[PDB]
């Protein structure tokens, strides 16, 4: 293009470079020096304009990928790094992921495609992986796809808190409940429940019936999360066994959702025994 004016030929990445114009940076900064001295570029208060010129440099120097070295100290250039470029990285580290996502906090299209490249390499979404990912974007897990979630090792379910599972829709919790039910079947009773408790969004009838027998004490909130379809074919007995003493507050949700349908599907002569004064059903015999 053009040759660099006398003296301006940068022998080191100093502070001076903030004063060079767009075109001066294009010419005067050796590409090979930028790569080896990448550690320093964070500190140097460049403009966005000035960085566009430093991005395009490294693009030339590595037109096939990007050493983890550069990726480490990439600094604020992650934002300018087009998703297309990132789709071809060999990141393969947790500290570099942390590094890149700390500044990402400062959707985000780049963020997504990066994470997908860490797992796509790592092979499975491990516990410690999902631990640090949620430490920046907690609802990550409930952001993924029904299908996508299959790859998750049941071992990884342990890393999940209840926090995560608020943004989670049914068609997701469906894929999530099975895995938890395997991760948490080395437990029983006062142990099993605490853990399994959040996921019961997915849980079907058969699995709820078993819980009753184990004298579990559920609350009305948790109950209101149970699949509508899964509530219908439960006895007045099995309802009062799950809810135990919290059954008292069930009157309130009479005309709500999970229990609305349940009440109607049941005989008046059955409900009466609950001492709640619910109406709707069959007056038989």
């Amino acid at each position: 293009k053009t040759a660099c004016p006398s003296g301006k030929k940068a022998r080191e990445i100093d502070e001076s470079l903030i004063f060079y114009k767009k075109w001066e940076l294009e010419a005067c900064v050796d590409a090979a020096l930028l790569a080896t001295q990448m550690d320093r570029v964070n500190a140097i208060p460049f403009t966005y304009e000035q960085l566009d010129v430093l991005k395009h440099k490294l693009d030339e120097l590595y037109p096939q990928g990007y050493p983890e070295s550069v990726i480490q100290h990439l600094g604020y250039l992650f934002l300018k790094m087009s998703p297309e470029d990132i789709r071809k990285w060999n990141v393969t580290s947790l500290e570099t992921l942390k590094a890149l996502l700390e500044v990402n906090k400062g959707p985000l299209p780049q963020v997504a495609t990066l994470i997908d490249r860490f797992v796509k390499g790592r092979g499975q979404l491990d516990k410690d992986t999902l631990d640090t990912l949620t430490a920046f974007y907690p609802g990550y897990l409930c952001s993924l796809s029904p299908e996508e979630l299959s790859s998750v090792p049941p071992s990884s379910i342990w890393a999940v808190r209840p926090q995560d599972l608020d943004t989670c829709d049914p068609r997701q919790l469906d894929v999530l409940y099975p895995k938890a039910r395997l991760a948490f079947q080395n437990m029983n009773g006062s142990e099993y429940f605490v853990k399994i408790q959040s996921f019961l969004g997915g849980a079907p009838t058969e699995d709820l019936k078993a819980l009753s027998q184990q004298n579990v004490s559920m609350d009305l909130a948790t109950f209101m999360k149970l699949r509508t379809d899964a509530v219908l074919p439960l006895t007045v007995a099995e309802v009062q066994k799950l809810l135990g003493p919290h059954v008292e507050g069930l009157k309130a949700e009479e005309r709500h959702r999970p229990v609305r349908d349940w009440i109607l599907r049941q005989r008046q002569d059955d409900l009466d025994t609950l001492g709640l004064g619910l109406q709707g059903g069959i007056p038989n015999g």
Epitope: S217, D219, Q240, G244, P245, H246, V247, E248, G249, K251, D272, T273, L274, G275, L276, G277
Partner: antibody
Framework: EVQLLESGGGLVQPGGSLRLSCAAS????????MTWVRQAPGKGLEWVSG????????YYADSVKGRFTISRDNSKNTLYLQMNSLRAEDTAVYYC????????????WGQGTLVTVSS | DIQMTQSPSSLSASVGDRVTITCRSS??????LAWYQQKPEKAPQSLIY???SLQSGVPSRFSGSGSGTDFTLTISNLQPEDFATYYC?????????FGGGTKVEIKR
């Protein structure tokens, strides 16, 4: 409008008889379990008996075992406590209480009727 | 006979205080615990069912917590209408049991 009006409470000679009566009004008496709860003058609270929503199953304190009899009448909106072989120790205010559920807490109490047992 | 026992028996506090009452069953009773207010010459009134749940028409300054064999009625920012006797009751098993009560007095 919810009102539980206990009555029949008076003075009785020891070993005497007496039947109490809680009149319900402003609820579906049919569809609630009630109990009797008594309170010694200047002492604490004590559960005495309890009838289901059926009338079928009846529970009592060992204190009053087979001397008291809880009954109910959904037609007349009434709950009854027969009390025979009354002793000095059974002197108290008797509250008729409405559970918010069978195997639940008493959510409504009556103003409560006083039974004195003396010669 | 499940033994319920409250702490303290008597407690004097001033208005706008956070008062804590204790209840302790001799045996596990999961969450089958209730709290009852009684002001003299009047009937008892329900505050808490299922160890935690507010009854309706009851101020939120009333906060029940606990399970197993340890429970806690906590009256935040006390009012004059709250100076009264408080009773914890188990409905886990017959026979049903209340505690001793806790006479909550005004302080001066």
């Amino acid at each position: 409008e919810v009102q539980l009006l206990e009555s029949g409470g008076g003075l009785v000679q020891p070993g005497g008889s007496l039947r109490l009566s809680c009149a319900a009004s402003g609820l579906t008496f049919r569809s609630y379990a009630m109990t009797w709860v008594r309170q010694a003058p200047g002492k604490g609270l004590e559960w005495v008996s309890g009838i289901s929503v059926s009338g079928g199953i009846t529970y009592y304190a060992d204190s009053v075992k087979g001397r008291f009899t809880i009954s109910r009448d959904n037609s007349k909106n009434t709950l009854y406590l027969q009390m025979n072989s009354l002793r000095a120790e059974d002197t108290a205010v008797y509250y008729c209480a409405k559970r918010g559920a069978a195997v639940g807490s008493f959510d409504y109490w009556g103003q409560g009727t006083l039974v004195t047992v003396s010669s | 006979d499940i033994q319920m026992t409250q702490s303290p028996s008597s407690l004097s506090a001033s208005v706008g205080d956070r008062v804590t009452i204790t209840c302790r069953s001799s045996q596990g009773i999961g969450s089958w615990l209730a709290w009852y207010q009684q002001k003299p010459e009047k009937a008892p009134q329900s505050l808490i069912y299922a160890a935690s749940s507010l009854q309706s028409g009851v101020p939120s300054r009333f906060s029940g917590s606990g399970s197993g064999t340890d429970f806690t009625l906590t009256i935040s920012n006390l009012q004059p209408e709250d100076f009264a006797t408080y009773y914890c009751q188990q409905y886990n098993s017959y026979p049903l049991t209340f505690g001793g009560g806790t006479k909550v007095e005004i302080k001066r």
